Amino acid sequence: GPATEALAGEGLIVTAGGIDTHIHFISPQQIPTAFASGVTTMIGGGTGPADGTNATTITPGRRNLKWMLRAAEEYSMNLGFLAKGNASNDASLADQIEAGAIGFKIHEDWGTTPSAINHALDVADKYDVQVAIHTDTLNEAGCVEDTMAAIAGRTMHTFHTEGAGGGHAPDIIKVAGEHNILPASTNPTIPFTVNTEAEHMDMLMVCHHKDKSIKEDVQFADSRIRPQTIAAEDTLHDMGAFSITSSDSQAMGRVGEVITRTWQTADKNKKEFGRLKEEKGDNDNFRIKRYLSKYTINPAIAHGISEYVGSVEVGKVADLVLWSPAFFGVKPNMIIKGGFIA
Amino acid sequence: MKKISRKEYVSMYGPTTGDKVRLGDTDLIAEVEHDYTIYGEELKFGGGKTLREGMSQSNNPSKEELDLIITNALIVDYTGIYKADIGIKDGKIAGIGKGGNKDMQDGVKNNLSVGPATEALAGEGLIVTAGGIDTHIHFISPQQIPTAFASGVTTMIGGGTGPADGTNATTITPGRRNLKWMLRAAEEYSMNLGFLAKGNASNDASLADQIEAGAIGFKIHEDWGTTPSAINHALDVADKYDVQVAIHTDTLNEAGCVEDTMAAIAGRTMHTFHTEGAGGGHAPDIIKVAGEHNILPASTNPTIPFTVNTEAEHMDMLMVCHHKDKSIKEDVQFADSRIRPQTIAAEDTLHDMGAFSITSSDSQAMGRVGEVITRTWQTADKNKKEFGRLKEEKGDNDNFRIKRYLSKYTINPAIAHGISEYVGSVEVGKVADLVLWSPAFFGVKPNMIIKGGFIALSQMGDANASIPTPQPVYYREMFAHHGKAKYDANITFVSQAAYDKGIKEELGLERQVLPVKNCRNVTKKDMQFNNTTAHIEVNPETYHVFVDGKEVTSKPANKVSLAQLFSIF
Amino acid sequence: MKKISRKEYVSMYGPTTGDKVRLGDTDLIAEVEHDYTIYGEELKFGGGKTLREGMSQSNNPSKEELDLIITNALIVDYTGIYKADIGIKDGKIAGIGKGGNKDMQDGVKNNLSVGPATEALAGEGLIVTAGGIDTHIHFISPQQIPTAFASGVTTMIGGGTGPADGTNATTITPGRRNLKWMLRAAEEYSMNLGFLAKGNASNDASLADQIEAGAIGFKIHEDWGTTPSAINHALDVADKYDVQVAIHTDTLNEAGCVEDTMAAIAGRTMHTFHTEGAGGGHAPDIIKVAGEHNILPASTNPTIPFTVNTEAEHMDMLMVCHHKDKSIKEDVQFADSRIRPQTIAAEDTLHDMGAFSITSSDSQAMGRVGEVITRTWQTADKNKKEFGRLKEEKGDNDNFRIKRYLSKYTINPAIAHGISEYVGSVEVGKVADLVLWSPAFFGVKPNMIIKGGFIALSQMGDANASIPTPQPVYYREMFAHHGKAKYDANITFVSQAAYDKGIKEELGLERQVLPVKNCRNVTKKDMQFNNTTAHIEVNPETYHVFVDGKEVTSKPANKVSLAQLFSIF
Amino acid sequence: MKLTPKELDKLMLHYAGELAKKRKEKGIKLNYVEAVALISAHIMEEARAGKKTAAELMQEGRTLLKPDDVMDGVASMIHEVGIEAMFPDGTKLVTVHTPIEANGKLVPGELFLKNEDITINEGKKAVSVKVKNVGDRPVQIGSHFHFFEVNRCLDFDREKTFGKRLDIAAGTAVRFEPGEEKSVELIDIGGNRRIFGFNALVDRQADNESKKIALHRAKERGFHGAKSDDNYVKTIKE
Amino acid sequence: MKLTPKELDKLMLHYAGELAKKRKEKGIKLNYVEAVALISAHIMEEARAGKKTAAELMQEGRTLLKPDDVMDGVASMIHEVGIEAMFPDGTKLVTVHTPIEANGKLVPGELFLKNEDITINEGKKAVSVKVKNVGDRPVQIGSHFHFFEVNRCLDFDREKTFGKRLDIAAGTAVRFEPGEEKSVELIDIGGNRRIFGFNALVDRQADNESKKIALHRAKERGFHGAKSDDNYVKTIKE
């Protein structure tokens, strides 16, 4: 009617906004970056360029939750925050949720122990909120077998399940095959390029304070940056084994290339494994949906916001991004936030 | 209780007692005076470090639990130079000491307890100081703020209404309406603010109304007519409202000489801007005022430090300004009766002597709002290189002298304007305006600026990168700079009167609003490490400066530290 | 800068650094550790003295101006024993240092500024300590309050509903209704109050409701059935509500032995009353508990100190009570299995060792609510006379030991019940509950009791006389004891829960109401100068006490100080 | 040409490098900013060309400037220069460690420590314990971790390490390669000795009694070395 | 490389200068923007080199462009080019006065006044007064300052200048070097002749009676020339 505006879409492809669920709120400049890349929703944790944040995606305590929620008013991007699950104190655990958090995040640097893990999960069950986790690399508390026993079969969002981004050395990647797990891969090791192995060793060394002359230091580096489990990843995605593609911004992740890399990987796997068995007809439709879901409807469900966003469906918030077929997966035409051009 | 070497220890927790740090590329060497930690229990955040569940981080915190801990930071403050953890809660510095988890570590006050609600900030290897406070700002352009900010300054006090001539000439926001505009404009920025009103009026009613309107004080300035009448009237009303008064002396000596101006002040408190003279003021003996008891001497950025180029530079600014000509003698006279190279060089030394107390900028009007801190340290560097260490110095360091200069742009400006209780030094109970300095870049380029207990600005790299370190690495706005967060993190200062009249609700001000207090009972003796009084004369003929009989002067310099080494421009 | 002798100086301002005072008629000698004043500028009030207009008293005070200054007082506190002025503002101790008029005197923080609004209280020659805190009170009769008060105690924590058997036997105010009665009754008195609820219940719901109702904690008592069930349940709910729990051990060992009770406590925090045994508890090795980490050992008034009469006396109380007979053997057995003269004498020494931490009373039920302080010092006197000075003692004084005992009835009971932040020691920021002691009468009869920053009780003479000194001179209620003033000066403590539920408005409580906090993260290691832990055994046969292998015991006494010398009865 | 904000970031960096070089050209001792930008701008182009691999540029960047090209102090300053560029295989993080050398005196913020050794954990008498990693995966324990509850793989006398932690500098750790066997030092935990969390083996006051409970628990949980169940007498709460 | 916002400002200016030059290279009449940027970019580098002093660059900047290099109008436009750069002694303000010359017609916004003289202070008949500065410091009085109350140093017939001001163009002033002696013109103050402020010598209606009070006041305050106290008869308010 006379009240409706017109937007030409012929020749263009429309998809839902992307949803990055492994964000480190290190710097607010990330937002307009992730945005320009087709992402309309960022879920993570932090308080800015503070070491705790650089290491983990956590916004600790209700006060720091306040700061961030009030800060969020300023940006153009749906937001959600995760709280410090690294606590065996039930009271402190629920208060952060009552304070505004959409879930918890257990992280190594804060001590991902079977205690913390167990406690967090219980409170998470009460408040019907999600829990993300970064496995105990050093295996100090136990091995991936133990961490699972800790999870006791409850739901979990596993970040960078592969291992490079962190986690039980060296068999953490196995978790991504269990029923109760929500496997997610971290941006960096995707896709597997001739440079990814060299690159990482550097990040892991520039970080953690590792030396070339110290053997214990070279050991940890090799017990974490397995080129084997890295390459095994690209294929796991193709198999439907992995489900979500994150970024891990400003901390071994590139918040501006989640979408771009999700498609690069899909391209590789086709070039190396060919079309898919499930594929029907002379196209890649099925495989296409496989990857799309990885950064739209799957992250949306994993964090209880699937009803409002996460896919181009009637009744949902209108977070749509128009893609010009040639630039698809890299540079989008325009980002419409909440039904209006942003 | 196995032991470890000092070299090692320091690469994990930073310098400890008795160790020394060189400040930037200067010759100023600081020494850690004390350490509150407990060797073996120090706090560390990381992969397998100490700050984790059940360990350093308590599972049974105290009901005072911190929101943020800056671990192993070296605190440089007029109160001392030492090692200790800084605890932050509710926008305020909640504690300075050990801190960690009492459940697993000895000696940890509950105001320093670390729980699941506290965030971690690594400070080992870094130096923490309070935010700087520039009190001679011309609100000429809002772009100054992010500049002063990037330089370690969290508080700007001054006057104006933007690029208007009145403002370019004076630091004044005239009348309650223009006070309104500015207070409401301030909501937008990341920097505590305070405004000065037009003291150039012999109308008591107009004088108090500007305070009732929100001003933290008055400013008497030449261009508006700094007369003994205006001066006298302003001061009286200033006494009633316990608010501060700044002044720019009558250069042209039209109403009288510096002797008269003083008689006008009648011994009451006063903040003298650019007391030296170049920035303006009684020709040519205004600099003498900075030796009286009731005076709060402050120097203006430009003529500091005294470099081989400062004399030439100024003559230009003074000429490009005022409309002076080379062919007109009266014009060359005024220029020479104001830009005395003698009183300029005498300055650098006066600071070193504790004679001068505050270092301003005088932004966009013979001042560089981005180099107050940098220049305060350059000067300190020179004076050491020319006069050596200090007599008061104790031990093989420059600690004392260090505090001398720090105070010049932190605790001293804070007191001079009644906001010492909330800000102006790294002390428990005060607003948490802290800036982390990386020893090499000290005094020039800081690591990050925390406003009101939360990170507001920090060096940031490629927002797309896998870490915050890769280039480009410039100063990026942090979270306390956006949304409604800015409001919680910033403060606009006002007088008790306005505060009491509800000036906050009055103007829909969403910012934390505090009032200034204790401005009328302070003297030169309230200026930390800069309380030196003295009967100083000034030769009318040679423009030479004499103090307590003798004469003081500094030698210009061909090179200064904290300069070309750190900036591409 | 003329100088004066020490004898003189001390008769004007009181003892200064290095000087020593004898405490009452005891052998305990205290030494002034430091002095914040500035010889020549000390404060004095009087006819032609220093505290007058324009002089010590400012005509330009700071906007923090004090409401009251206690001049030249000797502060005896676990934080130290020193000389200094005490500043009081808004019911709180606002400052501890020089103070006076910055306008005419060097070094005077603005939190100590004296203006026309500040009152003067002379303290030279007197000793100032915090109010005492009795945490084992039986609210048997309201007449106890003015008694405990007259003795230097400003805070009573306990339970009950008046002269009812349940109360006479236990310190418990059961159920929210009876909690209401008592909170509303408390409005009437001059003494901070806190109540404990019936922990003798294995019903979680009933357990928390009493806290939600206003209780600062629970009390498990024998007469109500101190079982491992009740004990376990109570503790859990206590952990949730961050409130404290006191306990009276199962003497009859019916449920189990002290080993079991501990297993019940499961390592959680606990305030053990009369840990010795005479006041009640596991027969006969309950006293061993006072050596564990998670325990907050407290001794009950009666068996302190150990006098040649204490053994005979007790047997009588225990017999007059419980309904015991001399002809019945089971009756003589219980008497001997509870009133062990061995564990009694072992007590006095345990206190001296830092093993025990708190000194209670146990009023109207095997305790004397008016002699807690007096007896705490008597004991200290004995132990010195029998064991001599202390190893930790530094210098030719008893300072350390002094603080050891003081802490026993001030800062230690305060912490044990989460009210350490507001009261419990002479420190800045805390409620001003101070009691002035005249060195001779120290520990027995105090000069005046200031409640909440205002004088509530003091020695007073003939109300008709021309001065306050003439006889009769007994303790008369002062102004902070009457009208609506009492309300501003007193505090009734409650739990966070109740406080948050609006328990104050709930019950029409006109008293300042604060909540207790940090009760679940404290251990024996939080007890000032009484943090000694140890594995102590107790012979089942000889009832002999052994610690860390060796054995401890004290010798009874035929005479004690602070007794017949000061009272007509 | 839909330029991302990231792209603009780099385009600016590049001309900061270009300036940097143009200045060196004219023969002028570069500074901190100039040296870094230069090294950054360089690597950026090389990745564009698609020739040099990530691994190679890490080094080649160390040859862009010689000690006499920069100002004194610059060396001691540029510890390293991280930078991201788009290779034919996508963006990768190149870290050029210590690009130039310290051919001079001046060293900004340099430290003047005082040869002597800090004595850690004063008066906490350590104890040695035989430890072996019977598992097939690595296991590294932190400095303040209740030792008694580490990976159930590390075999040793649990009983002896109750309420203790690795007597080492705060924040560090000890590594145990599968198969490896070593003896570690471990002092007692300070503070209130309130052990909560970890493996949930204690969660209360650490005393001799809690110990009984801890061992019993570890026992049933399979923690190697966790003594044995010589008939446990369960308390009213555990 | 913690780049300040100031640094970015300059880095942008520089490439505005670089463009400016590159264009002149190709031989193209620069314009207002181009000329200025160019001059600015130049001075900037020179300060970087640490050779030329501030004072020298002030001039050298006047030789960066010749009248035939720019477009007509540019000269009459660039009155001057202020710029700040970091010298080895820190940043300093370099003002390059009139960098190029007017080798042409066109002059933007040029003025076409009309030879004739504006007659100031119409009908306010002036009066001359002997004035001498007996003090050892300079003294300059403004055009609208109640003359009667200037520095107590200037000696002259105060009585004669009551309610008057220097009959000169609004905004200007008259200077008096220590020792100097001159005769100044001064008309009467207009408006309501309500004198408030200054030295507080009047603060009321300027009339013959207020005058009495003014002189009496100045007298006691030591203002040279302030007639004398031939026995004053104090009013009910003054």
Ligand code: NI
């Ligand atoms: Ni991670």
Ligand code: NI
């Ligand atoms: Ni991450």
Ligand code: NI
């Ligand atoms: Ni000025």
Ligand code: NI
């Ligand atoms: Ni100014």
Ligand code: NI
């Ligand atoms: Ni009892």
Ligand code: NI
């Ligand atoms: Ni009792």
